Structure 1
Amino acid sequence: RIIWGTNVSIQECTTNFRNFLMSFKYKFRKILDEREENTTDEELYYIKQLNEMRELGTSNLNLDARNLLAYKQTEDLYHQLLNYPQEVISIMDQTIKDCMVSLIVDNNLDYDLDEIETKFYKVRPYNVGSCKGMRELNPNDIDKLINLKGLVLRSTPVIPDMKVAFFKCNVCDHTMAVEIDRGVIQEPARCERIDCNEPNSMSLIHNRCSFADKQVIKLQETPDFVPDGQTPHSISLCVYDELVDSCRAGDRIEVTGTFRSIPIRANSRQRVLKSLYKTYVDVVHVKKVSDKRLDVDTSTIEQELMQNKVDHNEVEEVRQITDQDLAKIREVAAREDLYSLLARSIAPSIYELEDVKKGILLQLFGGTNKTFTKGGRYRGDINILLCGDPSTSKSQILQYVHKITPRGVYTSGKGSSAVGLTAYITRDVDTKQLVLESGALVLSDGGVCCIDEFDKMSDSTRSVLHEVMEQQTISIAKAGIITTLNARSSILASANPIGSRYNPNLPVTENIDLPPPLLSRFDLVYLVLDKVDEKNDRELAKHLTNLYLEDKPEHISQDDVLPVEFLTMYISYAKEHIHPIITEAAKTELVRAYVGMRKMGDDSRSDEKRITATTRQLESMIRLAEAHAKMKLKNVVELEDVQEAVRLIRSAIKDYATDPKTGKIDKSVIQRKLQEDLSREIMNVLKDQASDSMSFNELIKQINEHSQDRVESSDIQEALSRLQQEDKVIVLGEGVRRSVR
């Protein structure tokens, strides 16, 4: 039968769809995906889900449209879905109930064949192809299946909706109940079964009448593409009876639903309407939070859909994976200069100041969510201030990162207030509820933020940080409402030392202005100091003039290939397929590293001027080393992977013991003595080692490992080079090292 309004005939669709629901297997999906193969040898996926639901009575069947797509002879339906949801959904539910019936007439007992057939069945097709957010939504697709992302602002309280009337038992004494099946409600003039009152005033008992949940959910899409000038848009939503309350305020949900368009009234007295319809989205399915908190539930059966959703994590969350892409990934991971390479691969236009890039990269992979049943909220990510002499790429690095990440929210300082930093709540008097608004920090829930002129920020502001940075929550308490909105977000602030540059006659923690609490709050502080080198200076000048040479300049730095686009998907794979477990050996070297950090910081006059190593130093070391191990796709933290973490934390501090003001205008006498004693000992060994030849490595294990920590061993290279000039020994091939006759 052809449809007068869609010309999409039913019989063929239902017929193909039936054996579609019986021919379905995991493999179709795998072939399109191209991922490595079993799924218990590809059992029938749909009968799996169908049996499970029949036994659980969910009557809701989640479905990824790409699955139905990846099967032969169904793409017709796969597109008609995107084009005729209003009826393909109907025929889908019909087929669902009918295959339930065939299954139960094959499967002896379930619902006695009737309780099943009585209750309806709804389908939940999600992930039909992510549309291009709001500003793309065309009035040409008024009735199509859109996918939208973005957090929700406000949820109207549960609103009932008439479904079946229950009309007043008249003096005739036989109440009558009737549904509506449209926006119309008909009350029969005559009274009840007997026409005791043919003329009658039938009334309605609006308490026993059934109802249906209709929740209106405003939505503010993610600022993935919002160019400038306009605040990210908003698309009101409606939800019908099963996904209701699956989305509280503040959540970061994703939705797949049909677009709609309805006129409005102006006077509301006369029946005349207005052109320029208003629009919303009748949702169909809601990807729950796109998060992994899993503290407690929110709603009814819907959580069963959430459990059916979370298990397929790999392809659905990567949104793209191929072992040619994954092979490229593992290959890159194999490359040795990785930590260097990817560093520059973040901001290729940025010059030699690599350690900044390193810290930034480590921020991108930030930490792992260790969720405790007791305690909890251990700020899974990190936070990086950076400061230094004006005009030193800081602000541009921030721009660069904010562009890199898929969730960044740029923001300035001193042009912003505490409300801007942490959403502000409003008791809406319309429905007397809690709405949240414009959290700059909340927009960045997940993924980094950026903040400039951090010093120039007001003291009235720069106080919400004192909370959000260490608990990732904001506890607002004003006249109407008290609440705590959690905003997990890795801040990344620029700065400017007081005045307009250093004063290497001034203490460092005074040269930075911020108070020590908020300062130690920052996981990692950089001091990008400007030098008068004249050795890098001309290199930098060339590094600018070259980009000015071309018209459309690319790869401003050395011409080494680096994957400007690949690295983003690389990151969004790493942060989600690997969770570093801190092995035992790491624990030791981490503890000793902390102890050494703190004992060094010890002093009597370190109290007022220095930055003291405190427990957050250990938090930094651990949350940062596990991020390093997440990089390189390492599944478990090694021991030689916290060492560079220590190095990075020491980027700021290396050069002062009792008083700050590093100074350190970079061959020392104590270095002379070091080389000299090493020469003594190594000559004594090689003259005691009668087999006069041994490798540099063997010699190192002979001496440099007998006791406490190994030495550079390139200072050993200079030692043996001296012993070549002096000719006390002879390398005699790289494999060994002999002495002189």
Structure 2
Amino acid sequence: LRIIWGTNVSIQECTTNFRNFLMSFKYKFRKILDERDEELYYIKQLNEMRELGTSNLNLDARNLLAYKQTEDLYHQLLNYPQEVISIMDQTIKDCMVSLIVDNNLDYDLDEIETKFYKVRPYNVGSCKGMRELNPNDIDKLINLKGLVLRSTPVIPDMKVAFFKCNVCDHTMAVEIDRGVIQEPARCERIDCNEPNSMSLIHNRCSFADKQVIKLQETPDFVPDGQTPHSISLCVYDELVDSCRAGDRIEVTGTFRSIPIRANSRQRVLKSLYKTYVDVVHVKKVSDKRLDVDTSTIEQELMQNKVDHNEVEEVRQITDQDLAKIREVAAREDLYSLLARSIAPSIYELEDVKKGILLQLFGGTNKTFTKGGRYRGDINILLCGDPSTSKSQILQYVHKITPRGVYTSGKGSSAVGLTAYITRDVDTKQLVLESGALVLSDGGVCCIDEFDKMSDSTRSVLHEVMEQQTISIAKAGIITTLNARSSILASANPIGSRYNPNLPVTENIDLPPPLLSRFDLVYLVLDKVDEKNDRELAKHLTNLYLEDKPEHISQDDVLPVEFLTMYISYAKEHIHPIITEAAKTELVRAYVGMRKATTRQLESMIRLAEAHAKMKLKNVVELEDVQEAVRLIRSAIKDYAT
């Protein structure tokens, strides 16, 4: 028996126990874990990796918890990760080689002899963020759910130091040991001695990449009393430029502590330690929220290859899923199936839900190879009575969209919608933080009490609503920066309730041009009657029949986890061409409004093409304009007044 000091770990006993698992696992969690075909569950993923060069082994930690023989290990790597992962680095290499020697094989040997393999363990239990992390939790595996507010520049950090000798033509190198460079005073005596004369040469040395990232942390529960924490965390090589401002994330790593120097003068250290996460894995995506625009992020999809990391950017889907997607797309009522399943707790309002669905698809994005750009979006406003979906819709969008800041009222003004300059107290320098719209370079920016935002603030959106960019000239920065956000707005009329005896253009209390530059405006007036509000009341109270609404599967609707897999396919993979035959029905629909401005026309093409992203059509057909124009007219009840 052998054991590490301060530790419960036996190297060889864990080594064989990990191999025993690694050569025998087959989804036993489905059998054992709870009340929930395949084989060799990891061996396929290991013999997958060796031809791709993707040296990373992403590990679902809960494989071990359910499995019969490595409950003895889950509570070790969780509690001793720096050492237990150092074992896995070795065992996996030996467990790759066992798949060599059992194989008649080509020369994989000549590199995997030398190359290095690693593990990223992420699928661990939940925690109350920074707050529950009492000092007993120091140096343990942890995970955090949250988002990024800023990231520092890449920092050079020493890994081999170099020494140049002022005489006698021999240098020296030393590898760093646990944070020190033990510089030899002696001139490597056996050449000759001079007592103290040697140099240290910066540009000969070998460096790691380091990067630091600031995480706004958002627990699944927070105690009454709390407020958001800006954690500071560090990420090493192969994760630098993995994740960046506005991303919504699950990240895992080791919780740490470190001292701080009191001053730049002397080595007195503060005893009240600082704390951070050393990141080991980041889960860039989730099943519940859709996928970041592949056209926008095109610069980084290749950087992941060029940087040699497979930390994933886009949802993987199998043929069994795509086959279902296509078999679903053939049905006649998809146009209403999504518009119901988008909000299974929201009653009727299917004109609203449907145009919102057509916002999420975006439509089409296009450029002229230098001189111009156009993008698929519709910018939306909701108006009419209180006591309606308006505020709840802004949540469901927010909780599906991977990006977006729920701005609100007078609590949101120019310096914090666009970027601002601020003192980073942790280092005391001026640094630039992305504002709300800049963080929202994609997805949706969701705005509420839109008319109670001031006359001064509204003037930023007045550019952004179609030009999708913001341009700056204030001290320290002069740039135009991207603001690809779609915009969605909740508004209420002048006075209160609604008043049909005054024209809507006045009633909204929003200026005629900005109201026009919205692509779709919804009038959501109540107009009360029996045989609607009764059916609504039954629907609502069924949420209190069963104290959690698991029977909401009634009135059949898609699983959200499939709907997001559909949209993040259609969005990613279809570029719907507006056919030259579609013009003839399109222009008359515009001119019929003129008997109002091009924003309607520029909206209809961006809305109708989304109605071709839906149903996955590479080309627009004369029918799909017809539903799009009717939607515009009926969204403002154009027949009535």
> What per-residue deviation string (whole Å, max 9, x for no partner) do you get for residues 231-290 of structure 1?
643222222333334456566666432222224454788866555532211122445689
> What per-residue deviation string (whole Å, max 9, x for no partner) do you get for residues 6-35 of structure 1?
423222433354576677899999999999
Distance 1:557 1:297 in 2: 30
SS at match of 1:582: coil
- In structure 2, relative to structure 1, the CA distance for the partners of 1:473 and 1:135 (3 Å cut) is farther
Distance 2:532 2:295 in 1: 61
- In structure 2, relative to structure 1, the CA distance for the partners of 1:649 and 1:13 (3 Å cut) is same
> What per-residue deviation string (whole Å, max 9, x for no partner) do you get for residues 465-516 of structure 1?
1333324433333221133443443322122344557776765445544445
2:379–2:519: 8 Å Cα contact kept in structure 1?
yes
> What per-residue deviation string (whole Å, max 9, x for no partner) do you get for residues 673-704 of structure 1?
xxxxxxxxxxxxxxxxxxxxxxxxxxxxxxxx
Query: CA shift at 1:529, angstroms?
Result: 3.8
Matched, 1:119 2:120: no
SS at match of 2:169: coil
Max Rg structure: 1
2:28–2:67: 8 Å Cα contact kept in structure 1?
no
Query: CA shift at 1:524, angstroms?
Result: 0.7
Query: CA shift at 1:218, angstroms?
Result: 2.1
> What per-residue deviation string (whole Å, max 9, x for no partner) do you get for residues 132-184 of structure 1?
76566565543344444544333333322233333342556543332231223
2:238–2:308: 8 Å Cα contact kept in structure 1?
no
Task: Give the one of 375, 385, 394 matched to 1:398.
Answer: 394
Distance 1:298 1:345 in 2: 25
SS at match of 2:178: coil
- In structure 2, relative to structure 1, the CA distance for the partners of 1:636 and 1:86 (3 Å cut) is farther
- In structure 2, relative to structure 1, the CA distance for the partners of 1:518 and 1:334 (3 Å cut) is same
Moved more, 327-336 or 413-422: 327-336
Distance 2:66 2:302 in 1: 23
5+ residue gaps, structure 2: none
- In structure 2, relative to structure 1, the CA distance for the partners of 1:237 and 1:349 (3 Å cut) is closer
TM-score of the superposed pair, with normalisation by structure 1:
0.64
Query: CA shift at 1:640, angstroms?
Result: 5.3
- In structure 2, relative to structure 1, the CA distance for the partners of 1:123 and 1:539 (3 Å cut) is closer
Moved more, 79-88 or 242-251: 242-251
> What per-residue deviation string (whole Å, max 9, x for no partner) do you get for residues 74-106 of structure 1?
676566443432123212222344456667778
SS at match of 1:464: helix
- In structure 2, relative to structure 1, the CA distance for the partners of 1:74 and 1:436 (3 Å cut) is farther
Query: CA shift at 1:356, angstroms?
Result: 3.6
Distance 2:96 2:295 in 1: 26
Query: CA shift at 1:525, angstroms?
Result: 0.4
- In structure 2, relative to structure 1, the CA distance for the partners of 1:376 and 1:393 (3 Å cut) is same
Matched, 1:62 2:83: no
Moved more, 25-34 or 643-652: 25-34
1:547–1:554: 8 Å Cα contact kept in structure 2?
no
5+ residue gaps, structure 1: 36-40, 600-613, 657-741
- In structure 2, relative to structure 1, the CA distance for the partners of 1:320 and 1:574 (3 Å cut) is same
Distance 1:366 1:228 in 2: 39
- In structure 2, relative to structure 1, the CA distance for the partners of 1:61 and 1:29 (3 Å cut) is farther
1:62–1:305: 8 Å Cα contact kept in structure 2?
no
- In structure 2, relative to structure 1, the CA distance for the partners of 1:137 and 1:638 (3 Å cut) is farther
SS at match of 1:382: coil
Distance 1:544 1:121 in 2: 54
Distance 1:635 1:445 in 2: 26
- In structure 2, relative to structure 1, the CA distance for the partners of 1:172 and 1:544 (3 Å cut) is closer
2:378–2:486: 8 Å Cα contact kept in structure 1?
yes
Aligned-residue RMSD, C-alpha? 6.5
- In structure 2, relative to structure 1, the CA distance for the partners of 1:528 and 1:554 (3 Å cut) is farther
SS at match of 1:77: helix
Moved more, 387-396 or 426-435: 426-435
2:285–2:315: 8 Å Cα contact kept in structure 1?
no
2:150–2:214: 8 Å Cα contact kept in structure 1?
yes
- In structure 2, relative to structure 1, the CA distance for the partners of 1:631 and 1:63 (3 Å cut) is same
SS at match of 2:183: coil
1:191 equivalent in structure 2: 187
SS at match of 1:83: coil
Distance 1:586 1:237 in 2: 53
Distance 1:315 1:571 in 2: 22
Task: Give the one of 356, 359, 364 matched to 1:363.
Answer: 359
SS at match of 1:242: coil
2:627 equivalent in structure 1: 644
- In structure 2, relative to structure 1, the CA distance for the partners of 1:642 and 1:8 (3 Å cut) is farther
1:54–1:110: 8 Å Cα contact kept in structure 2?
no
2:470–2:480: 8 Å Cα contact kept in structure 1?
yes
Moved more, 637-646 or 297-306: 297-306
1:64–1:127: 8 Å Cα contact kept in structure 2?
yes
Query: CA shift at 1:385, angstroms?
Result: 0.6
SS at match of 1:435: strand
Query: CA shift at 1:453, angstroms?
Result: 3.0
Distance 1:304 1:76 in 2: 40
Distance 1:67 1:578 in 2: 37
SS at match of 2:560: coil
Query: CA shift at 1:461, angstroms?
Result: 1.2
Distance 1:66 1:312 in 2: 27
- In structure 2, relative to structure 1, the CA distance for the partners of 1:243 and 1:189 (3 Å cut) is same
Distance 1:88 1:448 in 2: 42
- In structure 2, relative to structure 1, the CA distance for the partners of 1:246 and 1:406 (3 Å cut) is closer
Query: CA shift at 1:651, angstroms?
Result: 2.0
2:424–2:431: 8 Å Cα contact kept in structure 1?
yes
1:351–1:557: 8 Å Cα contact kept in structure 2?
no
SS at match of 2:583: helix
2:104 equivalent in structure 1: 108
Query: CA shift at 1:551, angstroms?
Result: 11
SS at match of 2:557: coil
- In structure 2, relative to structure 1, the CA distance for the partners of 1:8 and 1:435 (3 Å cut) is same
> What per-residue deviation string (whole Å, max 9, x for no partner) do you get for residues 623-664 of structure 1?
4345556668999977655433322211245547xxxxxxxx
Query: CA shift at 1:556, angstroms?
Result: 13
1:245–1:299: 8 Å Cα contact kept in structure 2?
no
Query: CA shift at 1:391, angstroms?
Result: 6.4
2:291–2:315: 8 Å Cα contact kept in structure 1?
no
- In structure 2, relative to structure 1, the CA distance for the partners of 1:293 and 1:396 (3 Å cut) is closer
1:89–1:123: 8 Å Cα contact kept in structure 2?
yes
> What per-residue deviation string (whole Å, max 9, x for no partner) do you get for residues 714-740 of structure 1?
xxxxxxxxxxxxxxxxxxxxxxxxxxx
Q: Which has the higher contact order (CA 8 A, sep 6+)?
A: 2
1:83–1:145: 8 Å Cα contact kept in structure 2?
yes
Task: Give the one of 546, 550, 567 matched to 2:546.
Answer: 550
Moved more, 181-190 or 312-321: 312-321
- In structure 2, relative to structure 1, the CA distance for the partners of 1:395 and 1:193 (3 Å cut) is closer
> What per-residue deviation string (whole Å, max 9, x for no partner) do you get for residues 187-239 of structure 1?
34433233854754555334433332222222234698779986643222222
> What per-residue deviation string (whole Å, max 9, x for no partner) do you get for residues 54-89 of structure 1?
677665555555678898866765664434321232
Query: CA shift at 1:185, angstroms?
Result: 3.0
2:581 equivalent in structure 1: 585
Distance 2:413 2:433 in 1: 13
Matched, 1:129 2:125: yes
Aligned residues: percent identity?
100
